[PDB]
Amino acid sequence: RFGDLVFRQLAPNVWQHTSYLDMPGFGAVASNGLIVRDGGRVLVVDTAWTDDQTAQILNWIKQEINLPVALAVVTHAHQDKMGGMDALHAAGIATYANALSNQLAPQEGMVAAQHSLTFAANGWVEPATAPNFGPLKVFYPGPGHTSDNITVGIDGTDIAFGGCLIKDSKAKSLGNLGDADTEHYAASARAFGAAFPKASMIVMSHSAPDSRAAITHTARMADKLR
């Protein structure tokens, strides 16, 4: 039911879900997402690589929490974050993604979410496109690792999730630059830091949670791209 995945409590109301890619050509690549308990409900950030693993996420919530799952947000269109979209849809869960991510989805061989988020000129999601997100604060830093990458803070916790935008403080490099925007990358990573200026824990797309140092390390590496 929920065997393959790893679930790690990061705060009383917040857990990290981790799933591993099984595909020929690849190592077992970790992908992280978040489960957030808000009062009498649960919110999910990102799926797992596959429908099956994503369903395991829902089974864990059922067994370990036993509150209904209100909504899911995906932070960019890639298999690792979007892979299980139809598992969410099949469970009757409302899904949200940046409009651009929904547009990119089919190009990526992935299913789009049900609703498109839009963003104000200052980078903050428009509350009309993100009803009842509660503690979830959603920000679009501008183009970075990808053009569609979005970021989320969790109110009352001091954790923020950069998605693919922020690399670990130990990272040798910025990783896959295929979708990257060379000139705006540094500015985007710094905008993220200023958007969640109080967050002491930055959740990573692949490795373990890091500190604000990751943000600085990333921006400085991106400074050399230009």
Residue numbers in the entry: 45 to 270
Sentences from the paper on this structure:
Three of our apoNDM-1 structures are zinc-free and are the first structures of a wild-type apo-enzyme in subclass B1. The model for NDM-1 Δ38 contains 226 residues (45–270) out of a possible 232 residues and 131 water molecules. In apoNDM-1 structure conformations of some of these residues are very similar to zinc-bound states (His120, Asp124, and His250), while others show somewhat different side chain orientations (His122, His189, and Cys208). In the apoNDM-1 structure, two water molecules are coordinated by zinc-binding side chains, including Asp124, His122, and His250.
NDM-1 has been reported to be a highly potent carbapenem-hydrolyzing, zinc-dependent MBL.
